[PDB]
Subunit: 302 residues, 4 copies
């Protein structure tokens, strides 16, 4: 499918960008800019902006557009930029897609619309409408059954990823039989592994990249896994995945987004490491570990 | 809980009319509000799931809340569903509900992202504060929210200061009985229309539901029949409601209700917002026949 | 199938200190149930710990219960196994012992297609040799998720006279009743019995009927007479007991209550079920005394 | 328990058109596996249709397999039942027949507490009298949802030497390996074998190894050689076969391929399993021919 061929340039390891907030839970613009540069300096292939990790679903459309605009100013032409524009509403999703186009993003993406049960035909129309509003930007279908409640069959996934204008699939599923099945059906499809804690295994199963939240603090590790596997150095790939999972273990305990924001706070990137309500603060007993992790990561990096 | 005793009854979960451009249809909203008042409904639950809240902006939700208050304040009870995923957004809507003179606020357990139980409690606390004296109706709908509260957690939520009711959209009638047993004075709304009679028997003392927009009097009739010990009439009414619900599930529930209301000369354009699609045209004869049946009744 | 309508205790299987069948306690439990005014017994079901018994042990229980109670109350033999052939054996034995009906749980563990489920029931019905089949639906334990349409096909199979509906979905209970006005339809979850009857069930089969079957008969009566408050009160009292039994473990909690009622010598379930925690013994003792004083 | 590390076929149990054990085909299937170069056999498991056989039938199969294979390849006896006592009888029999290890699925149908699962394993381990235990985790069929902490407790019980992990959660696979660097850890889902090895499994137990065990051994080899492309190519070929087997039904599909390889006389599973849809026979025959020519 030629739409898959035309999206070849989107293959890679893309950080799901966090949205920094200030003490009053408004956008912290200076921290957002610092975070974008910090990701570029890690050697990340691109950014996935306004996704789950960006706390999109506790932001308004206007807030999401501001983030999109700022990220484009900072990063357009330097690394790939995918705009997650998905809302429950098709119309809202289209507005964000239109804005992504205006700001010069390389792609758009939409989570399968959630809360209300929609038919598969309704899902397909949703993506079509957003693709039209994206005005040439390729679409990354975003599948995350754990949070969306949307339970697509493989046949449905196949239809979705071959809609005109779709160039990739962000597969946030731990089912690696299905990962292999998708690769086998679509040999040229850009296929992002969505769960960071199985990245090496997802690549082996057929993913050709990833999009993840933990890439913000250790994206070079995931780059290092791609490299190890390409060279056939399985031991280095396993070692890196194991180190990633030790960190993921801690972030699951602390809360993932806020744990990441706190680590980035000790890396001097984020000024105030809060998520938006109803997310609460990181428990203070985890602070030594998170600071320790921040120190560990800079020392292996710098 | 005995304070909020005035919130007991059968409250329609109000639909939000739209036009073919997907804009709010305010004329049809007003007509639908009056249609519900004329049916003898006890109140309206505004901007809930049935109201298509989660495909509207805050401004749109506020516009609807305002119009309903204009139409119905003082005539029937008004509950504003103000729930968003965001606490701050939910607080804005709660403050607006207060301004418009609603009798109560409500919020669905915040969804998509997993939140801890403590995070849920703080969310409700913050909204109650912004409601500034309006009692809170905790809204539990596990099937759509993905939030799996334990009974003990439900107990903690419903006894938070400012909480006067639970909207229990759950088919587990053991838990319905357990909630009634623990909280003898709690206003407890049955949320699944197709078990209303059984929910009342288990302990609910009223309900909030989408199908009440077209046949609210049948649910009042179940309440009446059960108060008089007339099981047979209660069962017959529930069976008739379920015959309708079978059809609505086939057609799509919100858009089916809006189509019935369209044939009743209430709603101009029976559309839901995208990504909801239109009613399959093969169902229109059944939906029209139903409107006629219900009007004659 | 109309004569199968009613309130039937899901009989427990008493065991001795060595986990073998305690035949004397079994006989005592059967009589105890008859004296409570139960309409019948459902023997060798989930509650009977069927799935930790051999086929010969299950036959032994069936034979003895028939000795005790045949002619006096209705007797339904749960003959269900994963294996069809094993299920057929028990069905043939039920017929020999003179049971009024057979029953089989949807076969579990391995996923079977719906037509495989249908063939399974057909085979068991053939082996039942004229005994009506009670289809037994319990999704929470069986893992089998039948659609309403599939339930409709199952309950209309030649030879099927009833459905034991162990589901808390009371929309579906009403739908089943509406589709099949004459079907015998047993409410399976004790803790919604009053509500299940209201939705369309015309009786029930349950584990807690062994210790308070008269309360459920009382709910049927109260509803028949339009005494909704009495029905609700009885359901509430049943649910207070069910709360405790869920804490203690239901089969062993029931056996322990029956032990304090002088019916069951040794109130053990079969391994891997463990014993009742000793800290719940005062509550279960208090419960037996209350129920005995209640009659 | 390093000696248990490897690629072990979950042996199918052949039956005839009467649904009786086909012992001649069992012996042939055992020999066929040995000649494929399999490391061992896991006997009377899910794939062996344990849960539609009597204890005696399961014992007969265990005895025959030991006769054919003892000392030539590793032998693991799946002795698991819902009942602890039944599981203990099979464990004692496995010991008598000279098996290298025993295994038990988490007991299913009735909800048991985690303590009750542990005591179940302790009892089976005692009856195995020195044979190491392979804890068998298969959430999708058993309905038992163990936490990582619970799995950690189980795999460290005295006498446990391995975990059969039939779960597609490869985060947990990695976590288990991280916690227990020396634990024998079998990948249970054949269609993610290469990925499970990468996450931390050090071998596997699977149903499809009966017809293409050498491919899985080839994946283990390719990964140790650091040849990722060959590991992927092999996994892709295994999944093309698995796609077909899932369409046909896996056990009966495997038996049908084996039939065309002249190993199994009658490719039937026991009722309530039905026969293969005849429209799939051309595909299943061609697969047999392909696989015979490849080996």
């Amino acid at each position: 499918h030629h739409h898959h061929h035309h999206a070849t340039n989107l293959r890679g390891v893309m950080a799901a960008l966090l949205t920094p907030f200030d003490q009053q839970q408004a956008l912290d613009k200076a921290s957002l800019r610092r975070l974008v540069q910090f990701n570029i300096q890690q050697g990340i292939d691109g950014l996935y902006v306004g996704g789950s990790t960006g706390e999109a679903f506790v932001q308004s459309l206007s807030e999401r557009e501001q983030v999109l605009e700022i990220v484009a100013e900072e990063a357009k032409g330097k690394i790939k930029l995918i705009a997650h524009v998905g809302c429950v509403s098709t119309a809202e999703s289209q507005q964000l897609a239109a804005s992504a186009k205006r700001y010069g993003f390389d792609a758009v993406s939409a989570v399968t619309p959630f809360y209300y049960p929609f038919s598969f035909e309704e899902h397909c129309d949703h993506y079509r409408a957003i693709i039209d509003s994206a005005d040439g930007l390729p679409m990354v279908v975003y599948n995350i059954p754990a949070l969306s409640g949307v339970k697509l069959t493989l046949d449905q996934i196949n239809t979705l990823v071959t809609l005109p204008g779709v160039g990739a699939l962000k597969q946030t599923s731990g089912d690696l039989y299905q990962m292999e099945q998708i690769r086998r059906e679509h040999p040229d499809l850009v296929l992002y592994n969505g769960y960071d804690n199985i990245f090496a295994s997802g690549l082996l199963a057929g993913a050709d990249g990833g999009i993840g939240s933990t890439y913000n603090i250790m994206g070079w590790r995931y780059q290092g896994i791609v490299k190890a596997l390409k060279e056939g150095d399985i031991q280095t790939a396993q070692k890196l995945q194991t180190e990633c999972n030790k960190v993921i273990d801690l972030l699951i305990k602390t809360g993932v987004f806020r744990g990441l924001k706190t680590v980035l706070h000790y890396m001097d990137v984020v000024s105030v490491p809060l998520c938006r309500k109803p997310f609460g603060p990181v428990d203070e007993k985890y602070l030594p570990e998170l600071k320790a992790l921040a120190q560990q990561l800079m020392q292996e990096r710098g």
